[PDB]
RNA sequence: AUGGGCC
RNA sequence: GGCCC
């Protein structure tokens, strides 16, 4: 986005500056080029001279202003994608009740009871549990009043800035490229779920290529559905973005909210408003109040869906800005936020699409960096989606999500105190697709120390998950 | 150390 | 409690 105002109000938003992540027994064995991101300016691992809280916001390098002609085309692509989207999902997008927003509904998980509260509830020493009854699904006086303000459309707020405590490639930890988390007031997240909760639940249920969204999918069982789909096309592209979230221009966001969340589609008038509040935001980091125009907050209730929707429109826009007579059936794509996989039978020139994505403020580059640019002829087994490859399982013939051995090694190298055992079992679900030999090697360091699931058991669990009949017929 | 997803 | 974005 574009930093338009930097202030120094006399109230610290003390940030958390000590990692919960610690090396495991595997760290000594795998020696990964990874490590927990820097949370403090006084981190010895940082490069001398690097000011953490200057690199954090360095991602905001402006807010691209689209011309009248470009804006007209974008609206035309937004409406077209919306048409497809609401054609599959339906028009049942009525506001969720205060109760359903908290407890959640079929296709939508419940709100986190004990996580960050936001402002100014943090400055007043209050957790979420004090403002909202997460059991019965009722709200306190504070939220109550705020919700009314949002109905009147007069509600203002500030985004709390959090240092994302996670494992990152050493080079970026040493550069100070710590990702940031935009914590929004709990009432804002609640109301957003009230406005578009029904819709989000529908997208999750109807995930797939036809709506261009993988949000809500289960890689275990859906890699077969996505795999056989893309394997039918001549060309498959693995496109990457740089600062996808931050580079959403205000023009694009506004038009997207206006075209997708119209009342005629079964939405509440305030569905469009609440989303537009994400466009112009004020961020509170310690003593500095930074006003940002453009970009998308990280802590939004539907950040992933918003990013995915945009991603779909961007592609349609870029293709229509370069070629003539481009429609939604000219290509196919699956998206999860900034993660994207495109496919088509036409020999599209993605390298030529570069300047067209720039008109949106986005910068595109080919995933694999062996080729100096986008190339044709790639298939589904060449690309990567959700940090997973598309590999064929010889025993079943189905596609299986396989993560790189380095990634898994990095994942198993670090863990937060007292959760090692529960993580191992979770990672085993990811590793199992790397084969018996690789699975065995990765968990070697943990043998005797923790319970490790047998490759056999997790393989059998998978076969039934992806196709029960196949597991049933296997007992002919 | 957060939003949504999935086990 | 983990992973993904
Ligand atoms: Mg990719």
Short mmCIF file of C-alpha atoms (C1' of nucleotides) and ligand atoms in Angstrom, two decimals:
data_model
loop_
_atom_site.label_atom_id
_atom_site.label_comp_id
_atom_site.label_asym_id
_atom_site.label_seq_id
_atom_site.Cartn_x
_atom_site.Cartn_y
_atom_site.Cartn_z
CA UNK A 1 0.00 0.00 0.00
CA UNK A 2 0.91 3.67 0.30
CA UNK A 3 2.14 5.16 3.57
CA UNK A 4 0.43 8.55 3.68
CA UNK A 5 0.79 9.50 7.34
CA UNK A 6 3.22 8.65 10.14
CA UNK A 7 2.44 9.86 13.66
CA UNK A 8 3.72 9.49 17.22
CA UNK A 9 0.83 9.22 19.68
CA UNK A 10 1.76 8.97 23.35
CA UNK A 11 0.66 5.37 23.89
CA UNK A 12 2.86 2.31 23.36
CA UNK A 13 1.43 -0.79 21.70
CA UNK A 14 4.17 -2.96 23.21
CA UNK A 15 4.92 -5.74 20.72
CA UNK A 16 5.95 -9.32 21.53
CA UNK A 17 9.71 -9.75 21.06
CA UNK A 18 10.62 -13.28 22.15
CA UNK A 19 10.13 -16.42 20.06
CA UNK A 20 8.19 -19.45 21.29
CA UNK A 21 10.00 -21.64 18.76
CA UNK A 22 12.90 -23.83 19.85
CA UNK A 23 15.10 -26.37 18.01
CA UNK A 24 14.14 -30.05 18.17
CA UNK A 25 16.32 -33.17 18.17
CA UNK A 26 16.13 -33.11 14.37
CA UNK A 27 17.80 -29.70 14.12
CA UNK A 28 21.17 -31.29 14.87
CA UNK A 29 20.64 -33.88 12.14
CA UNK A 30 19.09 -31.86 9.31
CA UNK A 31 20.87 -28.52 9.80
CA UNK A 32 18.30 -26.49 7.82
CA UNK A 33 19.05 -23.09 6.29
CA UNK A 34 16.14 -21.90 8.42
CA UNK A 35 15.38 -20.24 11.75
CA UNK A 36 12.80 -18.24 13.75
CA UNK A 37 12.25 -14.74 12.36
CA UNK A 38 13.72 -11.77 14.23
CA UNK A 39 11.27 -10.23 16.69
CA UNK A 40 13.62 -7.61 18.13
CA UNK A 41 15.91 -4.94 16.67
CA UNK A 42 18.58 -6.17 19.08
CA UNK A 43 18.69 -9.67 17.59
CA UNK A 44 22.34 -10.72 17.14
CA UNK A 45 21.47 -12.71 14.01
CA UNK A 46 20.42 -9.56 12.13
CA UNK A 47 22.71 -7.80 9.66
CA UNK A 48 24.47 -4.79 11.19
CA UNK A 49 22.57 -1.67 10.12
CA UNK A 50 19.23 -3.34 9.43
CA UNK A 51 16.42 -1.55 11.25
CA UNK A 52 13.66 -4.13 11.77
CA UNK A 53 10.74 -1.70 11.99
CA UNK A 54 11.82 -0.07 8.73
CA UNK A 55 11.92 -3.28 6.72
CA UNK A 56 8.59 -4.42 8.15
CA UNK A 57 6.70 -1.60 6.43
CA UNK A 58 9.07 -1.37 3.47
CA UNK A 59 6.62 -3.70 1.74
CA UNK A 60 4.34 -0.69 1.24
CA UNK A 61 5.87 0.72 -1.94
CA UNK A 62 2.85 2.69 -3.16
CA UNK A 63 -0.74 2.37 -4.36
CA UNK A 64 -1.09 1.94 -8.13
CA UNK A 65 -3.79 4.21 -9.55
CA UNK A 66 -5.56 2.57 -12.49
CA UNK A 67 -6.73 4.69 -15.42
CA UNK A 68 -10.37 5.08 -16.42
CA UNK A 69 -10.00 2.54 -19.23
CA UNK A 70 -8.29 -0.04 -17.01
CA UNK A 71 -10.86 0.45 -14.25
CA UNK A 72 -13.71 -0.09 -16.71
CA UNK A 73 -12.20 -3.38 -17.87
CA UNK A 74 -11.59 -4.53 -14.30
CA UNK A 75 -15.23 -3.96 -13.36
CA UNK A 76 -16.17 -5.95 -16.45
CA UNK A 77 -13.97 -8.84 -15.29
CA UNK A 78 -15.12 -8.54 -11.68
CA UNK A 79 -18.78 -8.79 -12.71
CA UNK A 80 -18.00 -11.71 -15.01
CA UNK A 81 -16.22 -13.66 -12.27
CA UNK A 82 -18.97 -12.75 -9.81
CA UNK A 83 -21.49 -14.07 -12.33
CA UNK A 84 -19.68 -17.41 -12.46
CA UNK A 85 -19.15 -17.43 -8.69
CA UNK A 86 -22.76 -16.75 -7.69
CA UNK A 87 -24.00 -19.06 -10.43
CA UNK A 88 -22.34 -22.00 -8.69
CA UNK A 89 -22.73 -20.93 -5.05
CA UNK A 90 -26.23 -19.45 -5.24
CA UNK A 91 -27.73 -16.29 -3.77
CA UNK A 92 -28.24 -17.45 -0.18
CA UNK A 93 -25.98 -14.79 1.33
CA UNK A 94 -28.19 -13.36 4.08
CA UNK A 95 -26.44 -11.95 7.17
CA UNK A 96 -25.45 -14.51 9.80
CA UNK A 97 -26.96 -14.03 13.25
CA UNK A 98 -24.71 -12.81 16.06
CA UNK A 99 -24.90 -16.38 17.36
CA UNK A 100 -23.96 -18.13 14.11
CA UNK A 101 -21.01 -15.77 13.62
CA UNK A 102 -19.45 -16.83 16.92
CA UNK A 103 -20.30 -20.54 17.01
CA UNK A 104 -19.97 -20.80 13.23
CA UNK A 105 -22.03 -22.86 10.80
CA UNK A 106 -21.70 -25.82 8.43
CA UNK A 107 -18.66 -24.91 6.34
CA UNK A 108 -17.45 -22.18 8.68
CA UNK A 109 -15.35 -22.83 11.78
CA UNK A 110 -16.08 -21.06 15.07
CA UNK A 111 -14.20 -17.94 16.14
CA UNK A 112 -11.07 -18.38 18.25
CA UNK A 113 -12.07 -17.91 21.92
CA UNK A 114 -8.68 -16.97 23.37
CA UNK A 115 -6.63 -15.10 20.77
CA UNK A 116 -5.65 -11.45 20.24
CA UNK A 117 -8.47 -8.98 20.99
CA UNK A 118 -7.35 -5.89 19.05
CA UNK A 119 -7.65 -2.19 19.87
CA UNK A 120 -8.41 -0.54 22.06
CA UNK A 121 -9.26 -3.66 24.06
CA UNK A 122 -5.58 -4.54 24.39
CA UNK A 123 -4.64 -1.15 25.84
CA UNK A 124 -7.40 -1.78 28.37
CA UNK A 125 -6.14 -5.23 29.39
CA UNK A 126 -8.94 -7.41 28.06
CA UNK A 127 -9.02 -10.77 26.29
CA UNK A 128 -11.74 -11.82 23.85
CA UNK A 129 -13.42 -13.93 26.53
CA UNK A 130 -14.22 -10.76 28.45
CA UNK A 131 -15.99 -9.05 25.55
CA UNK A 132 -17.76 -12.04 24.00
CA UNK A 133 -19.37 -15.12 25.53
CA UNK A 134 -17.89 -17.82 23.29
CA UNK A 135 -19.98 -20.55 24.92
CA UNK A 136 -23.56 -19.31 24.55
CA UNK A 137 -22.70 -17.05 21.61
CA UNK A 138 -23.68 -13.70 23.10
CA UNK A 139 -21.93 -10.32 23.16
CA UNK A 140 -21.02 -7.87 25.92
CA UNK A 141 -21.92 -4.16 26.13
CA UNK A 142 -18.73 -3.03 24.37
CA UNK A 143 -19.10 -5.12 21.21
CA UNK A 144 -22.85 -4.55 21.38
CA UNK A 145 -22.34 -0.80 21.00
CA UNK A 146 -19.67 -1.18 18.31
CA UNK A 147 -21.94 -3.42 16.24
CA UNK A 148 -24.55 -0.65 16.22
CA UNK A 149 -21.95 1.81 14.94
CA UNK A 150 -21.24 -0.55 12.04
CA UNK A 151 -24.93 -0.59 11.14
CA UNK A 152 -24.87 3.22 11.00
CA UNK A 153 -21.63 3.01 9.01
CA UNK A 154 -19.77 5.33 11.39
CA UNK A 155 -17.41 2.79 12.96
CA UNK A 156 -13.69 3.57 12.83
CA UNK A 157 -10.81 1.40 14.02
CA UNK A 158 -7.08 0.71 14.11
CA UNK A 159 -5.11 -2.38 13.09
CA UNK A 160 -2.75 -3.83 15.69
CA UNK A 161 0.64 -4.82 14.29
CA UNK A 162 2.02 -8.22 15.29
CA UNK A 163 5.41 -9.75 14.52
CA UNK A 164 4.70 -13.16 13.01
CA UNK A 165 6.60 -15.69 15.12
CA UNK A 166 7.55 -18.36 12.58
CA UNK A 167 10.35 -20.26 10.85
CA UNK A 168 11.91 -18.47 7.88
CA UNK A 169 14.82 -19.05 5.49
CA UNK A 170 17.94 -17.81 7.29
CA UNK A 171 18.65 -15.26 4.56
CA UNK A 172 15.40 -13.42 5.29
CA UNK A 173 15.75 -13.75 9.06
CA UNK A 174 19.14 -12.11 8.61
CA UNK A 175 17.65 -9.45 6.34
CA UNK A 176 14.89 -8.69 8.85
CA UNK A 177 12.11 -9.72 6.47
CA UNK A 178 9.83 -10.65 9.36
CA UNK A 179 6.23 -10.94 8.15
CA UNK A 180 3.62 -8.89 10.00
CA UNK A 181 0.17 -9.79 11.32
CA UNK A 182 -2.62 -7.22 11.14
CA UNK A 183 -4.80 -7.93 14.17
CA UNK A 184 -8.24 -6.37 13.79
CA UNK A 185 -10.67 -5.58 16.63
CA UNK A 186 -12.77 -8.64 17.47
CA UNK A 187 -15.99 -6.77 16.66
CA UNK A 188 -14.79 -6.04 13.12
CA UNK A 189 -14.05 -9.73 12.57
CA UNK A 190 -17.43 -10.65 14.05
CA UNK A 191 -19.42 -8.26 11.87
CA UNK A 192 -17.54 -9.31 8.73
CA UNK A 193 -18.60 -12.89 9.45
CA UNK A 194 -22.15 -11.61 9.89
CA UNK A 195 -22.06 -9.94 6.48
CA UNK A 196 -20.29 -12.57 4.36
CA UNK A 197 -20.13 -15.64 6.61
CA UNK A 198 -22.82 -17.51 4.69
CA UNK A 199 -20.97 -16.75 1.46
CA UNK A 200 -17.59 -17.90 2.79
CA UNK A 201 -19.10 -21.19 3.98
CA UNK A 202 -20.44 -21.71 0.46
CA UNK A 203 -17.08 -21.12 -1.21
CA UNK A 204 -15.41 -23.56 1.18
CA UNK A 205 -17.98 -26.24 0.37
CA UNK A 206 -17.80 -25.60 -3.38
CA UNK A 207 -14.01 -25.37 -3.72
CA UNK A 208 -12.58 -26.38 -7.09
CA UNK A 209 -11.45 -25.18 -10.54
CA UNK A 210 -14.92 -24.03 -11.60
CA UNK A 211 -14.93 -21.22 -9.03
CA UNK A 212 -11.13 -20.97 -9.12
CA UNK A 213 -10.75 -21.41 -5.37
CA UNK A 214 -9.08 -24.09 -3.26
CA UNK A 215 -9.99 -22.38 0.01
CA UNK A 216 -11.57 -25.00 2.27
CA UNK A 217 -10.03 -27.92 0.39
CA UNK A 218 -8.30 -30.97 1.85
CA UNK A 219 -5.03 -31.60 -0.02
CA UNK A 220 -5.16 -35.26 1.04
CA UNK A 221 -8.34 -36.03 -0.88
CA UNK A 222 -8.57 -33.10 -3.29
CA UNK A 223 -5.19 -33.48 -5.01
CA UNK A 224 -6.84 -36.27 -7.01
CA UNK A 225 -9.68 -33.95 -8.02
CA UNK A 226 -7.38 -31.06 -8.95
CA UNK A 227 -4.72 -33.28 -10.51
CA UNK A 228 -6.79 -35.15 -13.08
CA UNK A 229 -8.36 -31.82 -14.03
CA UNK A 230 -5.18 -29.97 -14.98
CA UNK A 231 -3.63 -33.05 -16.59
CA UNK A 232 -6.11 -32.55 -19.44
CA UNK A 233 -4.62 -29.24 -20.56
CA UNK A 234 -1.68 -28.55 -22.87
CA UNK A 235 -0.15 -25.67 -20.90
CA UNK A 236 0.15 -25.28 -17.13
CA UNK A 237 1.69 -22.25 -15.43
CA UNK A 238 3.05 -21.93 -11.90
CA UNK A 239 2.83 -18.19 -11.29
CA UNK A 240 4.35 -16.39 -8.30
CA UNK A 241 3.59 -12.96 -6.84
CA UNK A 242 5.78 -10.65 -4.77
CA UNK A 243 3.95 -8.89 -1.95
CA UNK A 244 0.56 -9.94 -3.31
CA UNK A 245 -1.40 -8.75 -0.27
CA UNK A 246 0.27 -5.35 0.03
CA UNK A 247 0.04 -4.52 -3.68
CA UNK A 248 -3.74 -4.72 -4.04
CA UNK A 249 -4.49 -1.24 -5.38
CA UNK A 250 -7.41 0.68 -3.85
CA UNK A 251 -9.12 0.92 -7.24
CA UNK A 252 -9.14 -2.86 -7.70
CA UNK A 253 -10.38 -3.57 -4.18
CA UNK A 254 -13.26 -1.08 -4.36
CA UNK A 255 -14.55 -2.34 -7.71
CA UNK A 256 -14.20 -5.94 -6.54
CA UNK A 257 -16.32 -5.29 -3.45
CA UNK A 258 -18.88 -3.40 -5.53
CA UNK A 259 -19.27 -6.15 -8.13
CA UNK A 260 -19.07 -9.30 -6.00
CA UNK A 261 -20.99 -8.28 -2.88
CA UNK A 262 -24.05 -6.60 -4.39
CA UNK A 263 -27.42 -6.85 -2.64
CA UNK A 264 -28.95 -8.41 -5.75
CA UNK A 265 -26.73 -11.40 -4.99
CA UNK A 266 -28.47 -11.79 -1.63
CA UNK A 267 -26.13 -9.63 0.45
CA UNK A 268 -26.75 -7.03 3.14
CA UNK A 269 -25.98 -3.45 2.10
CA UNK A 270 -23.33 -3.33 4.84
CA UNK A 271 -21.45 -6.27 3.32
CA UNK A 272 -19.77 -3.96 0.81
CA UNK A 273 -19.07 -1.24 3.37
CA UNK A 274 -17.34 -3.41 5.97
CA UNK A 275 -15.04 -4.78 3.27
CA UNK A 276 -14.19 -1.30 1.98
CA UNK A 277 -12.92 -0.36 5.44
CA UNK A 278 -9.97 -2.65 4.71
CA UNK A 279 -8.87 -0.38 1.86
CA UNK A 280 -7.84 2.62 3.97
CA UNK A 281 -6.41 1.48 7.29
CA UNK A 282 -4.50 2.85 10.28
CA UNK A 283 -1.84 0.61 11.81
CA UNK A 284 -0.59 0.82 15.39
CA UNK A 285 2.98 -0.35 15.98
CA UNK A 286 4.29 0.67 19.41
CA UNK A 287 4.33 4.47 19.32
CA UNK A 288 3.71 4.94 15.59
CA UNK A 289 0.31 5.31 13.93
CA UNK A 290 0.81 4.62 10.22
CA UNK A 291 -2.07 5.35 7.84
CA UNK A 292 -2.08 3.07 4.80
CA UNK A 293 -4.08 3.43 1.59
CA UNK A 294 -4.38 0.21 -0.40
CA UNK A 295 -3.41 -3.35 0.47
CA UNK A 296 -5.23 -5.95 2.56
CA UNK A 297 -4.94 -6.47 6.34
CA UNK A 298 -3.70 -9.92 7.37
CA UNK A 299 -6.07 -10.45 10.30
CA UNK A 300 -9.26 -9.97 8.30
CA UNK A 301 -11.88 -12.70 8.75
CA UNK A 302 -11.93 -13.41 5.01
CA UNK A 303 -8.46 -12.33 3.86
CA UNK A 304 -7.84 -15.61 2.02
CA UNK A 305 -11.16 -15.52 0.17
CA UNK A 306 -10.69 -11.85 -0.70
CA UNK A 307 -7.20 -12.58 -2.02
CA UNK A 308 -8.44 -15.59 -3.98
CA UNK A 309 -11.30 -13.67 -5.59
CA UNK A 310 -8.93 -10.90 -6.65
CA UNK A 311 -6.43 -13.44 -7.97
CA UNK A 312 -9.15 -14.84 -10.24
CA UNK A 313 -10.09 -11.40 -11.54
CA UNK A 314 -6.47 -10.36 -12.09
CA UNK A 315 -5.85 -13.27 -14.46
CA UNK A 316 -9.03 -12.61 -16.45
CA UNK A 317 -8.10 -8.92 -16.57
CA UNK A 318 -4.51 -9.50 -17.69
CA UNK A 319 -5.58 -11.87 -20.47
CA UNK A 320 -8.31 -9.54 -21.73
CA UNK A 321 -5.86 -6.63 -21.72
CA UNK A 322 -3.52 -8.51 -24.05
CA UNK A 323 -5.70 -10.82 -26.15
CA UNK A 324 -9.01 -10.35 -27.97
CA UNK A 325 -12.13 -12.41 -27.26
CA UNK A 326 -11.01 -13.85 -23.92
CA UNK A 327 -13.67 -15.54 -21.77
CA UNK A 328 -13.82 -17.68 -18.63
CA UNK A 329 -13.59 -20.92 -20.62
CA UNK A 330 -10.44 -19.79 -22.42
CA UNK A 331 -8.47 -21.04 -19.42
CA UNK A 332 -8.77 -22.70 -16.02
CA UNK A 333 -7.23 -21.95 -12.63
CA UNK A 334 -7.15 -22.83 -8.94
CA UNK A 335 -6.17 -20.28 -6.30
CA UNK A 336 -5.49 -20.04 -2.57
CA UNK A 337 -4.69 -16.42 -1.75
CA UNK A 338 -1.58 -15.48 -3.72
CA UNK A 339 -0.91 -19.13 -4.57
CA UNK A 340 -2.05 -19.84 -8.13
CA UNK A 341 -2.06 -22.50 -10.84
CA UNK A 342 -3.25 -21.60 -14.34
CA UNK A 343 -3.90 -23.87 -17.33
CA UNK A 344 -5.06 -23.60 -20.94
CA UNK A 345 -4.97 -25.33 -24.32
CA UNK A 346 -4.06 -22.03 -25.98
CA UNK A 347 -0.37 -21.15 -26.12
CA UNK A 348 -0.81 -18.04 -23.97
CA UNK A 349 2.16 -15.69 -23.65
CA UNK A 350 2.51 -15.10 -19.91
CA UNK A 351 5.82 -13.28 -20.35
CA UNK A 352 3.90 -10.70 -22.37
CA UNK A 353 1.32 -10.45 -19.58
CA UNK A 354 3.92 -8.99 -17.21
CA UNK A 355 3.25 -5.28 -17.89
CA UNK A 356 -0.49 -5.98 -17.71
CA UNK A 357 -0.22 -7.30 -14.15
CA UNK A 358 1.86 -4.20 -13.38
CA UNK A 359 -1.10 -1.97 -14.22
CA UNK A 360 -2.62 -3.54 -11.11
CA UNK A 361 0.54 -3.06 -9.05
CA UNK A 362 1.28 -6.79 -9.07
CA UNK A 363 4.53 -8.39 -10.22
CA UNK A 364 4.51 -11.91 -11.67
CA UNK A 365 7.37 -14.38 -12.12
CA UNK A 366 7.59 -18.09 -12.98
CA UNK A 367 7.77 -20.36 -9.93
CA UNK A 368 10.68 -22.49 -11.15
CA UNK A 369 13.81 -20.39 -11.62
CA UNK A 370 15.70 -22.67 -14.00
CA UNK A 371 14.02 -20.97 -16.95
CA UNK A 372 14.57 -17.26 -17.49
CA UNK A 373 10.87 -16.50 -17.95
CA UNK A 374 7.54 -18.22 -18.56
CA UNK A 375 7.63 -21.22 -20.90
CA UNK A 376 5.05 -23.43 -22.61
CA UNK A 377 4.52 -27.19 -22.39
CA UNK A 378 4.51 -27.57 -18.60
CA UNK A 379 2.11 -30.07 -17.03
CA UNK A 380 0.54 -30.52 -13.59
CA UNK A 381 3.40 -32.75 -12.41
CA UNK A 382 5.86 -29.88 -12.92
CA UNK A 383 4.21 -27.20 -10.79
CA UNK A 384 3.75 -26.54 -7.07
CA UNK A 385 0.60 -25.56 -5.18
CA UNK A 386 0.31 -25.02 -1.43
CA UNK A 387 3.98 -26.01 -1.08
CA UNK A 388 2.97 -29.40 -2.51
CA UNK A 389 3.88 -31.17 -5.74
CA UNK A 390 1.51 -33.29 -7.83
CA UNK A 391 2.83 -36.85 -7.80
CA UNK A 392 1.23 -40.12 -8.88
CA UNK A 393 0.73 -42.88 -6.32
CA UNK A 394 1.67 -46.14 -8.03
CA UNK A 395 -0.31 -48.30 -5.61
CA UNK A 396 -3.62 -46.55 -6.23
CA UNK A 397 -3.06 -44.43 -9.33
CA UNK A 398 -4.31 -41.32 -7.54
CA UNK A 399 -2.48 -38.01 -7.23
CA UNK A 400 -0.85 -37.28 -3.87
CA UNK A 401 0.46 -34.01 -2.38
CA UNK A 402 4.22 -34.31 -1.86
CA UNK A 403 6.20 -31.60 -0.08
CA UNK A 404 9.94 -31.10 -0.59
CA UNK A 405 12.19 -32.98 1.84
CA UNK A 406 13.91 -29.72 2.79
CA UNK A 407 10.61 -28.13 3.80
CA UNK A 408 9.67 -31.09 5.99
CA UNK A 409 13.18 -31.09 7.44
CA UNK A 410 12.77 -27.41 8.29
CA UNK A 411 9.33 -28.02 9.80
CA UNK A 412 10.59 -30.84 12.03
CA UNK A 413 13.65 -28.83 13.10
CA UNK A 414 11.72 -26.35 15.25
CA UNK A 415 8.75 -26.52 17.61
CA UNK A 416 7.06 -24.54 20.39
CA UNK A 417 7.66 -25.83 23.92
CA UNK A 418 5.53 -28.82 24.91
CA UNK A 419 3.87 -29.51 21.57
CA UNK A 420 6.47 -31.72 19.88
CA UNK A 421 4.46 -34.95 20.10
CA UNK A 422 1.25 -33.40 18.76
CA UNK A 423 3.18 -31.82 15.89
CA UNK A 424 4.99 -35.00 14.86
CA UNK A 425 1.70 -36.81 14.25
CA UNK A 426 0.48 -33.80 12.27
CA UNK A 427 3.60 -33.67 10.10
CA UNK A 428 3.41 -37.43 9.54
CA UNK A 429 0.22 -36.71 7.59
CA UNK A 430 2.27 -34.56 5.23
CA UNK A 431 5.38 -36.74 5.05
CA UNK A 432 3.63 -40.04 4.30
CA UNK A 433 3.36 -39.05 0.63
CA UNK A 434 7.15 -38.87 0.29
CA UNK A 435 7.43 -42.67 0.31
CA UNK A 436 8.45 -45.27 2.92
CA UNK A 437 12.17 -44.52 2.63
CA UNK A 438 11.85 -40.74 2.98
CA UNK A 439 9.21 -41.03 5.70
CA UNK A 440 11.55 -43.29 7.67
CA UNK A 441 14.55 -40.98 7.34
CA UNK A 442 12.71 -37.83 8.41
CA UNK A 443 11.45 -39.28 11.70
CA UNK A 444 14.66 -41.16 12.50
CA UNK A 445 15.79 -38.44 14.97
CA UNK A 446 12.53 -38.78 16.91
CA UNK A 447 12.54 -42.58 17.25
CA UNK A 448 12.42 -43.75 20.87
CA UNK A 449 11.68 -40.21 22.03
CA UNK A 450 8.16 -39.80 20.67
CA UNK A 451 5.37 -41.90 19.19
CA UNK A 452 5.69 -41.99 15.41
CA UNK A 453 2.80 -43.37 13.33
CA UNK A 454 3.67 -46.24 11.00
CA UNK A 455 3.89 -45.41 7.30
CA UNK A 456 1.51 -48.33 6.73
CA UNK A 457 -1.24 -46.94 8.97
CA UNK A 458 -1.10 -43.44 7.47
CA UNK A 459 -1.06 -44.87 3.96
CA UNK A 460 -4.14 -46.98 4.66
CA UNK A 461 -5.85 -43.96 6.22
CA UNK A 462 -5.13 -41.96 3.07
CA UNK A 463 -6.44 -44.54 0.59
CA UNK A 464 -9.83 -44.58 2.32
CA UNK A 465 -9.90 -40.79 2.62
CA UNK A 466 -9.36 -40.19 -1.10
CA UNK A 467 -11.55 -43.07 -2.28
CA UNK A 468 -13.43 -45.40 0.06
CA UNK A 469 -14.61 -47.68 -2.74
CA UNK A 470 -11.00 -48.27 -3.77
CA UNK A 471 -10.18 -49.30 -0.21
CA UNK A 472 -13.30 -51.48 -0.17
CA UNK A 473 -12.58 -53.18 -3.49
CA UNK A 474 -9.03 -53.78 -2.25
CA UNK A 475 -10.61 -56.59 -0.22
CA UNK A 476 -12.18 -58.38 -3.19
"C1'" A B 1 2.27 -15.04 17.59
"C1'" U B 2 -3.35 -13.68 14.09
"C1'" G B 3 -7.45 -14.54 10.03
"C1'" G B 4 -9.59 -18.28 7.44
"C1'" G B 5 -8.80 -23.44 5.87
"C1'" C B 6 -8.08 -28.60 6.66
"C1'" C B 7 -6.36 -33.35 10.20
"C1'" G C 1 -2.36 -28.17 19.97
"C1'" G C 2 0.10 -28.69 13.94
"C1'" C C 3 0.10 -27.43 8.80
"C1'" C C 4 -1.31 -24.20 4.70
"C1'" C C 5 -2.14 -18.87 3.16
MG1 LIG D 1 3.12 -21.29 -7.00
#
